């Protein structure tokens, strides 16, 4: 061959908070195969949407949508139990194969995206310039969304452990933890990274007796 196919933009999926999670880094020569494991956002969630994106922006909306499919039939389970393995496989012909398989159940759904799909050679240059120009705001969006996601994770896991401890949790601890949960829940609604991180830390500080019930 005289030529190799190389990705000019990151490829990946939309994850919680409308952020792009990259499966295939830009400047990758094909063929290539990459996979990452995702999970559900809620207890008893029966489906996940695989929204395939191309671009260098952090907000899913600012990137090029290549397609979407659902993986459904996820049997009821705790948040984080399902193991949704998402595979991006680009063959020699430049066709993107997207697979999502729950490795717990072997249930799988797929799409194929044609080598022609996505941004053109002008739009690629337009996308690279936008990412360059928006680099700082894009980073602050990504760091805020991730900090909220982390607060959300602590909030859910701490609530689970309160539920499990039941009547064994003393009243001083129950009152302090419930009150710390409300405070973090309120912080997540804001745009202040530091405020969410402080409420995470204050919850962690009062929850130590909680984990000592096991």
């Amino acid at each position: 061959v005289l030529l190799l196919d190389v990705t000019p933009l990151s490829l990946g999926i939309e994850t919680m908070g409308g952020v792009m999670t990259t499966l295939i880094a830009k400047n990758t020569t094909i063929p290539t195969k990459h996979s990452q494991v995702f999970s559900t956002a809620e207890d008893n969630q029966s489906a996940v949407t695989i929204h395939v994106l191309q671009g260098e922006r952090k907000r899913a909306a600012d990137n090029k949508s290549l397609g979407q499919f659902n993986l459904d039939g996820i049997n009821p389970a705790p948040r984080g139990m399902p193991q949704i393995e998402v595979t991006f496989d680009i063959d020699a012909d430049g066709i993107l194969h997207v697979s999502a398989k729950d490795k717990n159940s072997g249930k799988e759904q797929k799409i194929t995206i044609k080598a022609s799909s996505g941004l053109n050679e002008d739009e690629i240059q337009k996308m690279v310039r936008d990412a360059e120009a928006n680099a700082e705001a894009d980073r602050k969006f990504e760091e805020l969304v991730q900090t909220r996601n982390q607060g959300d994770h602590l909030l859910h896991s701490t609530r689970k452990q309160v539920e499990e401890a039941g009547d064994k949790l003393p009243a001083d601890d129950k009152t302090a933890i419930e009150s710390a949960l409300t405070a973090l829940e309120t912080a997540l609604k804001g745009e202040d990274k530091a405020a969410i991180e402080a409420k995470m830390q204050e919850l962690a500080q009062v929850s130590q007796k909680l984990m000592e019930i096991a």
């Binding site: 999926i13 939309e14 994850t15 919680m16 999670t21 990452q36 494991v37 995702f38 999970s39 559900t40 956002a41 809620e42 969630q45 029966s46 489906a47 996940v48 949407t49 695989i50 929204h51 979407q68 659902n70 459904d72 948040r79 984080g80 193991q83 949704i84 996601n149 994770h153």
Partner: peptide
């Protein structure tokens, strides 16, 4: 869009 979240890969103590 049924929400899909990151899964925290585990780390060992060496």
């Amino acid at each position: 869009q049924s929400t899909i979240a990151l899964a925290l890969l585990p780390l060992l103590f060496t």
